[PDB]
RNA sequence: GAAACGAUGACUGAAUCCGCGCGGACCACCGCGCAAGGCUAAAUACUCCCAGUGACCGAUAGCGCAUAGUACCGUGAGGG
RNA sequence: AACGAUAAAAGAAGUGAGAAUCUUCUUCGCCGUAAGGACAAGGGUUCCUGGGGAAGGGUCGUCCGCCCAGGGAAAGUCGGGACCUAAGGUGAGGCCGAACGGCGCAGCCGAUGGACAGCAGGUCAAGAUUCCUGCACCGAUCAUGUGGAGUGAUGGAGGGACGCAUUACGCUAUCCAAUGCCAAGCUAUGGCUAUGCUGGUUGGUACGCUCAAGGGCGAUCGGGUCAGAAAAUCUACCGGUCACAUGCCUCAGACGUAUCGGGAGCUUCCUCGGAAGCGAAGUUGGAAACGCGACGGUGCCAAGAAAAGCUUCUAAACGUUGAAACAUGAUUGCCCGUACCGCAAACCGACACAGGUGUCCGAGUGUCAAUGCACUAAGGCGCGCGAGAGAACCCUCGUUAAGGAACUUUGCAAUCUCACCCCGUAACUUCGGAAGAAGGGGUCCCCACGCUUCGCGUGGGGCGCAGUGAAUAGGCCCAGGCGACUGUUUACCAAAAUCACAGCACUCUGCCAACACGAACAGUGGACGUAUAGGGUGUGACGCCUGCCCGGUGCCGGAA
């Protein structure tokens, strides 16, 4: 049957993207929080 | 400058056969405009170009031990000149 | 008056349709058709607000002018009577000797080819746009505005009449289709006559579908819902309220007045609607 | 609470030296005080980073890592 | 236990340390509106070549979608951008709000849509409307000539500009037939000796007084200021005038001619089999699109985007011995996308998983028709354990004496029925229906006759148990309960008598409406609607109807 994850480049970028995350204080707060954890993958646009 | 733009010649059965019909093939800087490439080849070889085509080429992703990585993305440029003009340093080849 | 249908499908007996044989078969004016997107009854915060709206045929808007003061003095002729989807009334096209084309609500009787005149100096015949005071008493009229030049806000849906009870102060006593009596500034324009279509009240929808073609999503009985969903929800069967009839939000329906208690307009209402 | 005093949201709004504000309702007396104008280092806090030390740990311990926020899981936040 | 669909395998030959699994040959079997082909989304080198074999492969592997290396992807014309706007997202100013922030006109972003110049072939081991060949096209800049006075925006107008069902005429793609044309060779096993058999049978471009259905069509003068902010040869009004049948205009496609390809095969060389060279014919008859002519015709009600490019007119402007416009020539041609998988072993499902995945193409014979069913072409595949056995028992199937629901909670299950033609057909009813009610007959082959052909009727003859001869393929009825009806629902134990429904009633709401979302005197829905409208509540087609009780409670109204 049709499963949850149904890949869509533009979806992913527009939703979990760097521009997206920067558009809001809470997403900015993710960015900083992640940087802090030392993630290789700051954000989806890093893939 | 000019010379910076032309990274290397393309070496392969294909490319040789191409130069044998007077058509040459260069590994270029990924950002290069086709006009920039045209002009560059002209200055570097004093050759008039009548036709170019280019192509961005994703570098092969390879692995060394546990380390997975990508090679540099490149760009291939194919040029064809007029007058059956040839380029010596790469014709004998 | 209405088109009927032999019962060749079950939902085709009761069904009826309007009479269009008097509508000049015309596409609306390219210079007068606006784009009307729909809304789910959703507002700029995205929430359903107006409840049970959706679907239905695609609609273009046809710009109308109600305040005819733009073209007062000069007169036009009736070019045609076309169909408008977003209004209960049929509408009609105007060709001025002036050269402009306009759209006005189309009143009961008024035929194609007639001429009509806006502005204070105009006869009490069908279609003329007069200030209220210049209207002979007891006249039948519609398209009444509530402020001079603001535009017709009263008597617009099909087959509706306003009957001037008669002059007074600066103002004129007016009879509203609800049966309510109102005071309206005599400087306000109006247009002579009953509204039209008029047989509209008699058409029969017939099949669920028809509701959907008119962009009306099905309407949900509270009693079917659940406690969590709505006051009338719950119980172990078909149940009768178990409390006063009440809206989703809890305020009493059936009988509870709602018009705001202290309001400016009140001293212009001479008799409540009844 | 017998509720002083500061503090404002609403309404209202006095004296300037024999004047003004306090002293735990409130009055007299006796005492302390000069509101509605501003800045100010020092002692104090913390520890990403640096150095020294240890009746701290030595590979299931010690940081999650003898390094990795990687592999891996998750659409994502995030976990690891 | 299991090795992931019961579509199926056999032999030879090769290779190799080792082969049921790899390679070749010959067959066999399975898909063929697909299990074939082409896009999109997604994936990311999985493509090609050469090598490898630890692990990954449900066995084995010498093989692979795995591992290593190297190659491979070419665009002025296809798709996106340098153009356009929709929902939506934004948004100086501006409107609100403890803060972060919420709105918000113009403008702007935003394809799933508008717009827009290239076709036919060839070939790498791997690319092709990109490269090569052949001949077109587009804008832009300049030169030479035709120039010989206009050019026309950031504003105006025209235009772009749109639905559903049905349908007439002409054509193409395309498929069929043949003692048409062309090419090859053979005589099998009783016969045929070609009149048998196999295969092929026109794509682009240009021109042509050849054919051609269909489709598009007002012109001009003048008047009116008041309409288009203003302007205006433009537009819209009003008026006048112009030989209705049509001609004015267009030419899907056809024929012809010429030319550029292609073309069955033929040849030659040769290196687990490719390389080049060559080249025949082009008929007549028939079928036929959802494609094209096309923005066609008719009918319907629920009444069917926007903006730019485009055409037209002035404003301003610079001109008016260089203004548009044309012809030829030269020049120029950016950016990203193109490999491969792409109904799947390469995407989503932890798997090389019986699931899921949007659009186009989708041949023949037979069958009333068909994208149905059987077989099949092209193409693709035999589903990555195998071999024997031929017990119980289990699953999926075939048939079954006599009986026929005796079974059981219940005919649950399984059978019977089954297509098309003709005959025939009840109660009941809202006169539509019930209805394919029920029931009976027919169906194949030959021959003659008639008719409108692919066909059918009539007559007579023929063969079998049987003639929709195999596959697709309704069992029917009588009588209740509930719901009127088509519809809807509990993803993963309930599809129903649930919900919705057309109809009906009560009630509120006079428009800054009631009502609703909101930090909020913002904004928004309601609704660019206006009481024949809108909200809330109950009832639930239709028909006959819908009684008694206002004490309690709630609503409307009263007032000492
Ligand atoms: Mg390119
Ligand atoms: Mg590799
Ligand atoms: Mg209702
Ligand atoms: Mg329920
Ligand atoms: Mg409740
Ligand atoms: Mg209840
Ligand atoms: Mg105080
Ligand atoms: Mg140890
Ligand atoms: Mg076993
Ligand atoms: Mg298997
Ligand atoms: Mg088997
Ligand atoms: Mg050997
Ligand atoms: Mg096998
Ligand atoms: Mg062999
Ligand atoms: Mg396929
Ligand atoms: Mg790619
Ligand atoms: Mg193995
Ligand atoms: Mg070997
Ligand atoms: Mg491969
Ligand atoms: Mg080209
Ligand atoms: Mg916003
Ligand atoms: Mg698009
Ligand atoms: Mg194009
Ligand atoms: Mg384009
Ligand atoms: Mg036809
Ligand atoms: Mg044809
Ligand atoms: Mg024959
Ligand atoms: Mg013989
Ligand atoms: Mg624009
Ligand atoms: Mg490809
Ligand atoms: Mg799974
Ligand atoms: Mg398998
Ligand atoms: Mg599968
Ligand atoms: Mg077909
Ligand atoms: Mg077929
Ligand atoms: Mg089939
Ligand atoms: Mg085959
Ligand atoms: Mg395949
Ligand atoms: Mg038996
Ligand atoms: Mg028997
Ligand atoms: Mg019995
Ligand atoms: Mg059964
Ligand atoms: Mg009958
Ligand atoms: Mg029958
Ligand atoms: Mg017999
Ligand atoms: Mg018989
Ligand atoms: Mg059956
Ligand atoms: Mg039902
Ligand atoms: Mg049903
Ligand atoms: Mg369920
Ligand atoms: Mg069920």
């Amino acid at each position: 049957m049709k499963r949850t994850y149904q890949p869509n480049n533009r979806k992913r970028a527009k939703t979990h993207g760097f521009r997206a995350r920067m558009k809001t204080k809470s997403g900015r707060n993710i960015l900083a929080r992640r940087r802090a954890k030392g993630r290789h993958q700051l954000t989806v646009s890093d893939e | 400058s000019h010379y910076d733009i032309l990274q290397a010649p393309v070496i392969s059965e294909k490319a040789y056969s191409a130069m044998e019909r007077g058509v040459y093939s260069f590994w270029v800087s990924p950002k290069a405009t086709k006009t920039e490439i045209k002009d560059a080849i002209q200055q570097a070889f004093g050759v008039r170009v009548i036709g170019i085509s280019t192509m961005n080429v994703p570098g092969k992703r390879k692995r060394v031990g546990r380390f997975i990585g990508q090679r540099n993305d490149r760009k291939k440029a194919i040029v064809r000149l007029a007058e059956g003009q040839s380029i010596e340093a790469l014709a004998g080849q | 008056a209405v088109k009927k249908y032999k019962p060749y499908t079950p939902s085709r007996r009761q069904m009826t349709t309007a009479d269009f044989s008097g509508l000049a078969k015309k596409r609306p004016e390219k210079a007068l058709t606006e784009a009307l997107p729909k809304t789910g009854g959703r507002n700029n915060r995205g929430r359903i607000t107006s409840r049970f709206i959706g679907g239905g045929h695609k609609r273009l808007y046809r710009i109308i002018d109600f305040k005819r003061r733009d073209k007062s003095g000069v007169n036009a002729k009736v070019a045609a009577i076309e169909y408008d989807p977003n209004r209960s009334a049929r509408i009609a096209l105007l060709h001025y000797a002036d050269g402009e084309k306009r759209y006005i609500l189309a009143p009961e009787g008024l035929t194609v080819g007639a001429t009509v005149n806006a502005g204070p100096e105009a006869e009490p015949k069908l279609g003329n746009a007069l200030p209220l005071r210049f209207v002979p008493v007891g006249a039948v009229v519609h398209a009444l505005e509530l402020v001079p030049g603001k535009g017709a806000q009263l008597a617009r849906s099909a087959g509706t009449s306003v009957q001037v009870q008669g002059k007074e102060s600066d103002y004129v006593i007016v009879r509203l289709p609800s049966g309510e009596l109102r005071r309206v500034h005599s400087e306000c324009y109006a247009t002579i006559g009953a509204v039209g279509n008029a047989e509209h009240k008699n058409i029969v929808l017939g099949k669920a579908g028809r509701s959907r073609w008119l962009g009306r999503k099905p309407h949900q009985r509270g009693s079917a819902m659940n406690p969590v969903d709505h006051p009338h929800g719950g119980g172990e069967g078909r149940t009768g309220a178990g409390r006063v009839p009440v809206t989703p939000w809890g305020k009493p329906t059936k009988g509870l007045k709602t018009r705001r208690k202290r309001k400016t307009s009140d001293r212009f209402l001479v008799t409540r609607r009844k």
Side-chain angles (χ1 to χ4, degrees):
Chain A
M1 230 170 200
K2 173 129 133 189
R3 299 292 170 188
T4 67
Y5 189 43
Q6 303 277 327
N8 183 7
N9 288 346
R10 177 152 164 192
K11 173 70 183 183
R12 196 183 237 275
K14 294 239 171 173
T15 282
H16 303 297
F18 177 95
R19 309 282 313 293
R21 289 301 171 72
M22 281 287 198
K23 279 179 189 187
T24 155
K25 181 105 235 118
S26 342
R28 258 117 57 174
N29 280 351
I30 320 178
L31 278 148
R33 187 171 20 162
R34 304 257 293 176
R35 262 149 176 158
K37 196 179 171 94
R39 288 234 166 256
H40 267 226
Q41 200 185 295
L42 218 189
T43 279
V44 174
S45 12
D46 279 354
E47 275 164 2
Chain B
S1 64
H2 281 347
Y3 313 118
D4 274 10
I5 277 173
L6 285 77
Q7 308 274 34
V10 162
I11 282 81
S12 54
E13 206 221 34
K14 189 149 191 178
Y16 283 59
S17 316
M19 69 171 186
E20 293 190 72
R21 48 174 197 102
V23 178
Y24 301 98
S25 321
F26 303 92
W27 286 119
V28 191
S29 166
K31 315 289 173 66
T33 313
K34 278 210 279 175
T35 44
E36 295 187 298
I37 294 173
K38 191 186 199 305
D39 135 271
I41 299 175
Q42 293 173 330
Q43 323 284 51
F45 286 83
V47 177
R48 156 171 190 69
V49 174
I50 71 177
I52 194 193
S53 70
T54 56
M55 62 193 215
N56 274 94
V57 173
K60 307 202 181 180
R61 252 206 337 180
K62 299 212 160 174
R63 133 207 269 259
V64 168
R66 81 186 187 186
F67 304 86
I68 315 285
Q70 181 154 358
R71 297 172 181 176
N72 307 322
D73 296 308
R74 318 179 286 175
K75 168 174 284 213
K76 185 181 301 183
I78 292 78
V79 270
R80 169 200 147 118
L81 327 311
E83 314 165 26
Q85 304 160 292
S86 291
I87 62 150
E88 336 169 4
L90 233 36
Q93 185 78 294
Chain C
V2 174
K3 189 183 304 203
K4 291 165 164 171
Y5 291 104
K6 284 223 180 61
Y8 52 88
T9 111
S11 88
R12 196 44 83 140
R13 58 215 346 190
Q14 281 337 93
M15 249 187 82
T16 63
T17 335
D19 183 312
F20 313 100
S21 55
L23 290 186
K25 294 188 135 187
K26 173 169 281 292
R27 298 292 283 128
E29 207 52 58
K30 194 229 79 183
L32 277 174
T33 61
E34 208 126 84
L36 191 87
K38 283 163 187 148
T39 70
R42 289 133 207 279
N43 86 314
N44 56 353
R45 329 200 83 241
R47 321 288 275 259
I48 305 183
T49 301
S50 180
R51 208 162 96 109
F52 309 124
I53 318 184
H57 218 276
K58 185 159 182 274
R59 302 193 183 173
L60 299 158
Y61 196 81
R62 344 280 218 226
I63 273 182
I64 303 163
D65 82 305
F66 295 98
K67 16 80 170 292
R68 231 180 286 183
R69 326 180 88 109
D70 244 329
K71 273 315 218 293
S72 56
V74 83
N75 49 348
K77 55 170 146 69
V78 186
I81 320 140
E82 319 168 347
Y83 187 104
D84 190 318
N86 327 289
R87 225 157 329 276
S88 194
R90 308 154 187 164
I91 71 179
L93 185 48
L94 303 195
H95 284 33
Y96 292 92
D98 161 277
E100 187 176 339
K101 301 182 161 39
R102 281 240 181 108
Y103 260 125
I104 60 173
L105 278 174
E108 170 78 23
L110 176 55
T111 72
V112 57
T115 60
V116 141
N117 188 28
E121 309 78 41
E123 306 152 320
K125 24 161 56 186
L126 297 196
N128 303 117
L130 289 167
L132 194 42
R133 47 189 227 280
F134 275 74
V135 165
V137 208
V140 144
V141 81
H142 69 255
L144 252 73
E145 36 184 357
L146 285 173
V147 156
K150 164 127 74 189
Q153 306 184 313
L154 305 140
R156 308 180 58 249
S157 167
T160 56
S161 178
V162 150
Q163 221 230 1
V164 274
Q165 279 311 133
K167 235 120 72 155
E168 217 194 47
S169 189
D170 281 325
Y171 285 57
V172 172
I173 304 176
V174 174
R175 195 214 188 191
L176 293 189
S178 65
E180 194 184 67
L181 297 187
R182 169 72 105 93
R183 189 176 301 116
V184 178
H185 195 213
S186 73
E187 193 43 48
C188 287
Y189 265 65
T191 82
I192 301 302
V195 161
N197 203 320
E199 83 238 335
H200 173 299
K201 187 159 194 163
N202 300 32
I203 338 166
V204 199
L205 289 199
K207 59 193 281 185
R210 210 78 172 276
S211 293
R212 300 294 247 110
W213 303 354
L214 300 145
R216 301 178 198 172
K217 302 258 307 186
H219 192 120
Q220 192 75 10
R221 285 180 308 115
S223 311
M225 320 222 197
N226 281 119
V228 57
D229 282 318
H230 175 110
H232 304 12
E236 288 294 71
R238 274 170 159 295
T239 83
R243 66 148 72 190
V244 194
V246 133
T247 78
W249 301 266
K251 334 253 166 50
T253 184
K254 292 201 186 314
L256 182 70
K257 284 295 197 165
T258 41
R259 167 180 181 88
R260 215 175 345 118
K261 241 183 79 179
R262 26 183 57 202
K263 185 178 182 183
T264 295
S265 313
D266 299 29
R267 66 161 145 253
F268 289 75
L269 296 180
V270 25
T271 71
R272 231 319 181 201
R273 177 207 79 259
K274 263 220 180 185

